[PDB]
């Protein structure tokens, strides 16, 4: 067809933070479509990929991926907490990111 998307779009909002101290080890993700923790409970444990590009070709590609997963819900509005192998570079606040449907329970 014309669409081939097998993931859900999301936005990298910020790190986990207090009013004046942030914590880069936990990122905050807005998954689009979900507006409550009860709907966000479907997406727990799903893999997340941040997909970006670079000028230098490394192993056949100019596209590099950072992997992570959803761990828990955050707040009352469907924001989730996500942890990555290496933390997200904080210039990606507001950048798009992919939530895959695996590991599936359905």
């Amino acid at each position: 067809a014309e669409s081939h998307r097998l993931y859900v779009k999301g936005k990298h909002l910020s790190y986990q933070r207090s009013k004046r101290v942030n914590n880069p080890n936990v990122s905050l993700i807005k998954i689009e479509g979900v507006a409550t923790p009860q709907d966000a409970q479907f997406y727990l444990g799903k893999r997340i990929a941040y997909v970006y590009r670079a000028s230098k070709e490394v192993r056949g590609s100019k596209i590099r991926v950072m992997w992570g997963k959803v761990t828990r819900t955050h707040g009352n509005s469907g924001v989730v907490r996500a942890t990555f192998r290496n933390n997200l570079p904080a210039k990606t606040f507001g950048a798009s990111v992919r939530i895959f449907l695996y590991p599936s329970n359905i």
Partner: protein, 167 residues
């Protein structure tokens, strides 16, 4: 001397590990996976394609087929955590899937010397595929539009919420 000595040397004998208590009970699959279910492949080379599930294998994998005449997916095994069990059900009674096992799919592992600088199929595999898919498509021809459904790919459109969608 440059360094004097250590007064005691540590022993070089490696100890044995303790006797473990982790036996292997078999995998308890989720309830939506019954044989004959149409699955959607979430990842892999054939991602977004709808296949039919036949047999639960020994290494917790699912035996699936396209059929190969419909969408070009051969006889294959997939992971149960990388599929979506749709509610669409066909009957796979009349297919002899006990031939396939974990030794049926062997990669014939490659040596470190054989490096592909720049750049085939088992005849047993191809007539096994031809035996099973002609038994599947006879069950496919009963209810309408299943051949078209299995040939078409799955993809998420704008406005599709997977937490609200029923498959």
């Amino acid at each position: 001397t440059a360094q004097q000595a250590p007064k005691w040397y540590p022993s070089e004998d490696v100890a044995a590990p303790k006797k473990t208590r982790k036996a292997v009970r078999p995998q308890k699959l989720r309830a939506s996976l019954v044989p004959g279910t149409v699955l959607i492949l979430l990842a892999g080379r054939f991602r977004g394609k709808r296949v039919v599930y036949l047999k639960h294998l020994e290494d917790n994998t699912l035996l699936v087929t396209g059929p190969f005449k419909v969408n070009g997916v051969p006889l294959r095994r997939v992971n149960a955590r990388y599929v979506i069990a749709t509610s669409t059900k066909v009957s796979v009674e009349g297919v002899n899937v006990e031939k396939f096992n974990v030794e049926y799919f062997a990669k014939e592992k490659l040596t470190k010397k054989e490096k592909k600088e720049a750049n085939e199929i088992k005849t047993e595999r191809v007539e096994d595929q031809k035996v099973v898919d002609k038994a599947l498509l006879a069950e496919i021809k009963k209810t309408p539009l299943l051949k078209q459904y299995l040939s078409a790919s799955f993809s998420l459109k704008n406005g599709d919420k997977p937490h609200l969608l029923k498959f």
